[PDB]
Amino acid sequence: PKIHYRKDYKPSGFIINQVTLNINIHDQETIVRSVLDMDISKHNVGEDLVFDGVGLKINEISINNKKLVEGEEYTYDNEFLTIFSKFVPKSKFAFSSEVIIHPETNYALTGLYKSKNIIVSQCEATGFRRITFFIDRPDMMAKYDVTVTADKEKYPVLLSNGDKVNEFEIPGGRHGARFNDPPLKPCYLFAVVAGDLKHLSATYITKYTKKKVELYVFSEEKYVSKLQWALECLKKSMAFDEDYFGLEYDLSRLNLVAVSDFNVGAMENKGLNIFNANSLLASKKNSIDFSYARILTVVGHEYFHQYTGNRVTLRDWFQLTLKEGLTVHRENLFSEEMTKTVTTRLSHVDLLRSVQFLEDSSPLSHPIRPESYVSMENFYTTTVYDKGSEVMRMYLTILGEEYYKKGFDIYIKKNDGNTATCEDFNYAMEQAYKMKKADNSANLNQYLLWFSQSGTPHVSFKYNYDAEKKQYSIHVNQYTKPDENQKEKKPLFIPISVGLINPENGKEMISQTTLELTKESDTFVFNNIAVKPIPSLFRGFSAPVYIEDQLTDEERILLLKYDSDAFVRYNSCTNIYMKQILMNYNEFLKAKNEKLESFQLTPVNAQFIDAIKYLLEDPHADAGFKSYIVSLPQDRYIINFVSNLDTDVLADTKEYIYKQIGDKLNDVYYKMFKSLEAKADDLTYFNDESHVDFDQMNMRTLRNTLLSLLSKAQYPNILNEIIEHSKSPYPSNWLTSLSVSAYFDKYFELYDKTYKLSKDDELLLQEWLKTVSRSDRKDIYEILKKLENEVLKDSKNPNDIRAVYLPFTNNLRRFHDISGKGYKLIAEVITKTDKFNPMVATQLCEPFKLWNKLDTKRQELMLNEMNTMLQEPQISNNLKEYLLRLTNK
Numbered sequence: 001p002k003i004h005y006r007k008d009y010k011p012s013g014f015i016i017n018q019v020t021l022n023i024n025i026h027d028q029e030t031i032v033r034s035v036l037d038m039d040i041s042k043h044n045v046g047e048d049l050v051f052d053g054v055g056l057k058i059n060e061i062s063i064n065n066k067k068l069v070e071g072e073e074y075t076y077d078n079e080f081l082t083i084f085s086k087f088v089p090k091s092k093f094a095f096s097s098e099v100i101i102h103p104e105t106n107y108a109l110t111g112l113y114k115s116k117n118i119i120v121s122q123c124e125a126t127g128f129r130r131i132t133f134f135i136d137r138p139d140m141m142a143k144y145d146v147t148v149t150a151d152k153e154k155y156p157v158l159l160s161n162g163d164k165v166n167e168f169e170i171p172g173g174r175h176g177a178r179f180n181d182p183p184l185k186p187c188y189l190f191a192v193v194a195g196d197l198k199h200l201s202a203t204y205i206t207k208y209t210k211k212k213v214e215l216y217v218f219s220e221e222k223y224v225s226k227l228q229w230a231l232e233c234l235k236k237s238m239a240f241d242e243d244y245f246g247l248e249y250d251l252s253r254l255n256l257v258a259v260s261d262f263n264v265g266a267m268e269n270k271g272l273n274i275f276n277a278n279s280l281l282a283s284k285k286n287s288i289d290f291s292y293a294r295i296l297t298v299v300g301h302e303y304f305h306q307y308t309g310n311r312v313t314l315r316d317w318f319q320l321t322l323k324e325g326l327t328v329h330r331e332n333l334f335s336e337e338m339t340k341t342v343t344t345r346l347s348h349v350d351l352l353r354s355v356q357f358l359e360d361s362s363p364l365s366h367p368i369r370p371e372s373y374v375s376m377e378n379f380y381t382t383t384v385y386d387k388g389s390e391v392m393r394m395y396l397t398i399l400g401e402e403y404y405k406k407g408f409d410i411y412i413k414k415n416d417g418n419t420a421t422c423e424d425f426n427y428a429m430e431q432a433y434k435m436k437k438a439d440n441s442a443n444l445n446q447y448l449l450w451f452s453q454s455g456t457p458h459v460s461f462k463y464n465y466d467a468e469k470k471q472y473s474i475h476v477n478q479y480t481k482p483d484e485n486q487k488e489k490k491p492l493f494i495p496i497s498v499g500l501i502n503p504e505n506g507k508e509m510i511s512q513t514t515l516e517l518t519k520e521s522d523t524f525v526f527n528n529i530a531v532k533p534i535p536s537l538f539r540g541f542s543a544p545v546y547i548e549d550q551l552t553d554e555e556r557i558l559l560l561k562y563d564s565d566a567f568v569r570y571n572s573c574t575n576i577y578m579k580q581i582l583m584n585y586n587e588f589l590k591a592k593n594e595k596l597e598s599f600q601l602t603p604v605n606a607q608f609i610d611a612i613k614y615l616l617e618d619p620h621a622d623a624g625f626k627s628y629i630v631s632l633p634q635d636r637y638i639i640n641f642v643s644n645l646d647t648d649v650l651a652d653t654k655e656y657i658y659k660q661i662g663d664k665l666n667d668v669y670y671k672m673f674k675s676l677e678a679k680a681d682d683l684t685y686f687n688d689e690s691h692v693d694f695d696q697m698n699m700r701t702l703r704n705t706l707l708s709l710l711s712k713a714q715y716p717n718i719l720n721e722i723i724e725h726s727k728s729p730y731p732s733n734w735l736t737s738l739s740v741s742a743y744f745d746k747y748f749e750l751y752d753k754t755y756k757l758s759k760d761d762e763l764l765l766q767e768w769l770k771t772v773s774r775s776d777r778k779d780i781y782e783i784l785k786k787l788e789n790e791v792l793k794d795s796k797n798p799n800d801i802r803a804v805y806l807p808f809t810n811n812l813r814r815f816h817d818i819s820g821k822g823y824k825l826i827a828e829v830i831t832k833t834d835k836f837n838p839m840v841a842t843q844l845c846e847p848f849k850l851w852n853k854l855d856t857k858r859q860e861l862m863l864n865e866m867n868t869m870l871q872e873p874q875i876s877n878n879l880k881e882y883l884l885r886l887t888n889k
């Protein structure tokens, strides 16, 4: 159980200056020849030369063209190649090797593997060592000269990093291509692609240097028509980095490639970004609406890496959040500017406060810069990425746009072309902080705690207003619960963006203000406040914290209606719902525990329902925002507020609350569903793949949300609407008709209809699978079995497996069936998947992350299945480590 510690970072005693690869792809094997031009570093102390190399079959290895003999000069144990030091030269030397690998049977999808008819690599984090021997860590920077050869018919398109400098024919129907990439890079940014790829291309001319950049987007021939939006998103990303950050692309060409089998969303290999097909390909006929924001985000994300990750790289993997948190932050700025909808920021906050807050209060909780790891694959987390992004975003909130851009430029200018650490970034921001505060005395040392301290801070408020003095006070307290990482938690630097709303006319009472909370508690006083305000707190969600606003529901309602800030409006609504949910939960729980024959439930606040109606009926209000206010908080947001959560009782609670609101507003919902149709479903640009209207998609989101509400409520003759809806050309609509039809005997009719519509597009079929998996059906277990037998079968495609199972695990009532049979089902799938793909097996564990937050019976059921999984003799290191930590062993 090798544990790596952040504090233990030492530079290698070796240097690798040049990599010369020959990758020869054949039918049953791939032969990899490598020459490493190496040197001895100043940190060398005469140690053995130890290479990473996992699953390589050695034909031969050499030093300076002298063959090495196994056992006396080296040992290999399928993980580490150890060359005894006495045979290691003491100046510059060449190490060479020839190994055999087998991408055809590499179902783990790391290293070099076959996806359908495409050969592709994935090297982050430790994948390069599965291709050839290397000192596989990101601070080993080298030059790369790579030749790929293959059957010309099967693999006409050959790609790698850098410039293609030669193309040549080989006897026996083969051809080769040579790529030279002179700039130094870490090995996890190496990539190679071979296949029968088709493309779209365009030319981009950079803003300041006017350099011409060739843009290529690749897929298999069948889906080449789905590439157009991706290419537009790439143009957009380049323009945004130029316009916001002043950063131009530095290379001649950028390639994006879609493959069907991929563990994650995409990978930023230099000049050769490789994508999960579901994050690159779309068409309006064959994609749900969400694909358009997904592709925008992921193309943007990999593009912004070219600076934050690729030109400024990592010293060690413990600095992962320095490239990932920073790049998610850049991606979020981009997406907010491109979509111009408030729901974009709301969707990221919604994600963080559900999924990442759950993680941060689970036994898996870690800071965004961990102190140790066993399996690096288990560190690519919503904490490192999304909390990371919020920590990166707080610098911008604290500094404002001008000084943030000054600080960012300092970072890029002072670290371009080298490795860096989180401290480097904090340093650069600190220089900006000094400039903005106008005294060299100011510092951001406390800010570093955001990197080292795990857990979600709680922030609470108390208010005071003196009418005679016109004086207003906001007393603020912060607190982080102790956990297994820090016994004592320290106060953080918390930026609190605030406004003060005049409750009589809804107007702003003060200018934009960011309170800097740096103590455990503070009191912020405001003079010349004419009337008692309602505070608008953490505008834009200005810190990743639990907000306890201590406002009445009347005050929250007033903010919901009249505040300027989308997040505070959305949060005030969230807070009203949570108070209701907690109250009704406890009433239902008490009734169940005491086996009461009768009892009372607290009704939903009637003025709250009135406010929802007011917003819904306002034509000038935003459709996406409206869809949020008629939806209760995510189950995974709710569970952070309830101990021993009885999922049945929560399901009853949600049902009561939805019914209460629907009993008042269903006629309003129906009226809107009908009136939104013309604009929401407008077909004017349906055959234009570059025309994307995020407002219109939001209108469809609202219609489909309303349709779902009206369907669960069995609104009179709604089935008619559902049937018409299924005839819509937009897959968001006709797939919605499938899931809302669950409450009617027409379900399997629509099941068959929508299957036939989906079956001939790989990605659409996967969306169909998700829709079925998530269907609110009493026979969902039987339905899942049908999917397994008829559609999924023994597919090793991670998109297929995730589609069939993950959405189901969000079925509150059915997945958490008290028998434990849902838990048993997913555990079987995890154990089955772990035999060929440990990464995806660990992803499939996600339902278990909340295990110690449930009622005691369900806790026990989940724990049993995890221990059962842990006892599998063949369990992967990845899965074992994850479950060991999750079950607090």
Ligand SMILES: CC(C)(C)C(=O)N[C@@H](C(=O)NO)c1ccc(-c2ccsc2)cc1
Residues within 6 Å of the ligand: 124, 125, 126, 264, 265, 266, 267, 268, 298, 301, 302, 305, 324, 376, 377, 378, 380, 385, 839
């Ligand atoms: C978060 C998302 C969807 C943008 C994504 O695909 N992330 C990538 C990434 O950062 N691309 O630039 C990602 C996620 C996980 C890994 C990973 C590697 C070893 S285990 C998980 C690598 C890349």
Ligand SMILES: [Mg+2]
Residues within 6 Å of the ligand: 054, 055, 056, 057, 100, 101, 102
């Ligand atoms: Mg092997």
Ligand SMILES: [Mg+2]
Residues within 6 Å of the ligand: 260, 762, 797
């Ligand atoms: Mg397939």
Ligand SMILES: [Zn+2]
Residues within 6 Å of the ligand: 268, 301, 305, 323, 324, 327
């Ligand atoms: Zn990334």
